[PDB]
Amino acid sequence: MNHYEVLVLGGGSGGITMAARMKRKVGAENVAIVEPSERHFYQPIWTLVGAGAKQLSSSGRPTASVIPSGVEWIKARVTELNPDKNCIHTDDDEKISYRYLIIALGIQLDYEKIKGLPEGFAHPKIGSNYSVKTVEKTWKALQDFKEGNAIFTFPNTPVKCAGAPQKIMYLSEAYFRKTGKRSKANIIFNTSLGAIFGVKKYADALQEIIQERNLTVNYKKNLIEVRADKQEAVFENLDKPGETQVISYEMLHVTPPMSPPDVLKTSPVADAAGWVDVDKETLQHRRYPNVFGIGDCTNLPTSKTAAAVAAQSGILDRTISVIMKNQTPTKKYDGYTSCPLVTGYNRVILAEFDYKAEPLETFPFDQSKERLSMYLMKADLMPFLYWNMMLRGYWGGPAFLRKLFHLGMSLEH
Numbered sequence: 018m019n020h021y022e023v024l025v026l027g028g029g030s031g032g033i034t035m036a037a038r039m040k041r042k043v044g045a046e047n048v049a050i051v052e053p054s055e056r057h058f059y060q061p062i063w064t065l066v067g068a069g070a071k072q073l074s075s076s077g078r079p080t081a082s083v084i085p086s087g088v089e090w091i092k093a094r095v096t097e098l099n100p101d102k103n104c105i106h107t108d109d110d111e112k113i114s115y116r117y118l119i120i121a122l123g124i125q126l127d128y129e130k131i132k133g134l135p136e137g138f139a140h141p142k143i144g145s146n147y148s149v150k151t152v153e154k155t156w157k158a159l160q161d162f163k164e165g166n167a168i169f170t171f172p173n174t175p176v177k178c179a180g181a182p183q184k185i186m187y188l189s190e191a192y193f194r195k196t197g198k199r200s201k202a203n204i205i206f207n208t209s210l211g212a213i214f215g216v217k218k219y220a221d222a223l224q225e226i227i228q229e230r231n232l233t234v235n236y237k238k239n240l241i242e243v244r245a246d247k248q249e250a251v252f253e254n255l256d257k258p259g260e261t262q263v264i265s266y267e268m269l270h271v272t273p274p275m276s277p278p279d280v281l282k283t284s285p286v287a288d289a290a291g292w293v294d295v296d297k298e299t300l301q302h303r304r305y306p307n308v309f310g311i312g313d314c315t316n317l318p319t320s321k322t323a324a325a326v327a328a329q330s331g332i333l334d335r336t337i338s339v340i341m342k343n344q345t346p347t348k349k350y351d352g353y354t355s356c357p358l359v360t361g362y363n364r365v366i367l368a369e370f371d372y373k374a375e376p377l378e379t380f381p382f383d384q385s386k387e388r389l390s391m392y393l394m395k396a397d398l399m400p401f402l403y404w405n406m407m408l409r410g411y412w413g414g415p416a417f418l419r420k421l422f423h424l425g426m427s428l429e430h
């Protein structure tokens with residue numbers, strides 16, 4: 018049975034970042050990544066891809082080109098987790114043991130929970146920014162929009178980047194004004210949630226936009242059926258159960274229902290809902306002390322964002338180092354996360370907050386305003402930071418940046 022001191026499950030944002038950091042602690046030959054996909058994507062780009070502002074090719078690189086040098090890429094899927102015996106099963110019929118385990122399997126998309134998807138994507142006028150197979154269909158549907166309803170959904174499940182389903186709406190509405198079709202478009206946001214955003218400061222700002230641009234937002238409305246050939250969508254009224262509505266669309270962006278990865282749902286490392294059961298502050302597993310979790314696959318009570326993964330990687334780096342010296346972890350993860358809310362083709366409301374859902378802004382100015390600077394940062398600077406800093410283990414969030422920015426705001430006050 019092959020053994021690795023540190024075994025990383027998943028070759029995404031959290032997996033590649035943790036493998037880079039652990040490589041410095043224990044050596045590249047003592048680290049392994051279990052990842053099936055041959056491509057690695059910076060998913061935050063797909064919002065602008067579906068809006069036509071960015072190309073899909075720029076968001077992906079071969080998985081081989083982000084594996085840390087010297088670290089073994091176990092190209093396969095995880096099929097079973099047996100933490101009581103510190104081992105893992107693999108769709109190549111291979112068993113792997115570990116001294117420490119880092120689980121970073123992300124979140125799972127389930128378009129099939131909606132009738133009848135994904136078969137409906139074979140037809141025009143419908144897309145989804147959440148899949149590499151459908152993000153370009155969002156842009157094609159936005160280009161070919163003539164007249165009618167432009168409908169954007171938010172499912173009744175946990176999601177990754179909760180702001181993305183409404184980012185493309187603001188971008189679509191700006192495109193309609195840009196190209197002389199706003200008078201023809203009826204923009205509808207049907208969300209299963211009862212609020213536009215989970216933080217008061219940024220939700221109030223997003224509400225100003227919704228009123229100013231005459232966007233229709235129906236809360237507690239969930240998409241249940243797509244009749245793609247008919248170009249109809251069926252929504253259920255979560256507020257009055259039993260009520261359903263069939264509505265035509267000239268453009269339909271679908272945010273799929275999401276769930277923990279299937280291999281984790283009934284796994285011994287999951288909680289009652291299927292997420293990896295980890296400590297809120299240290300990211301160490303609550304049952305098995307040599308198991309750790311990071312990212313969308315965990316039950317960390319904060320937003321599932323790559324920005325949260327960056328902040329979690331720094332905490333988890335310390336947690337495992339302290340555990341490696343038999344000590345007790347002291348640095349607590351604050352639940353930092355950020356959703357770069359694109360409101361136009363050159364504006365971004367940069368929401369940053371913590372576990373208490375209170376703003377934790379990095380910059381001195383008020384980030385609840387739409388800013389060209391925050392757009393230029395997200396579009397033209399974050400991608401470089403992602404490939405070159407974070408995936409190499411040199412980015413643990415903007416905590417140090419926030420402190421030194423506030424120090425200068427004390428030098429001035």
Ligand SMILES: Cc1cc2nc3c(=O)[nH]c(=O)nc-3n(C[C@H](O)[C@H](O)[C@H](O)COP(=O)(O)OP(=O)(O)OC[C@H]3O[C@@H](n4cnc5c(N)ncnc54)[C@H](O)[C@@H]3O)c2cc1C
Nearest residue numbers: 027029030031060061094095122123178312313322323324
């Ligand atoms: C459209 C969109 C826009 C977004 N915009 C932003 C943004 O502006 N800011 C932000 O902070 N976040 C954003 N996000 C969120 C961000 O992309 C994710 O939260 C981030 O990638 C989470 O990292 P992760 O490692 O936990 O998951 P991932 O990066 O998705 O990694 C999961 C990996 O696990 C692998 N895997 C799955 N199952 C198995 C298995 N059984 N065995 C082995 N490997 C497996 C997958 O192949 C994948 O490589 C956005 C997401 C989307 C979809």
Ligand SMILES: [Cl-]
Nearest residue numbers: 331411412413
């Ligand atoms: Cl760090």
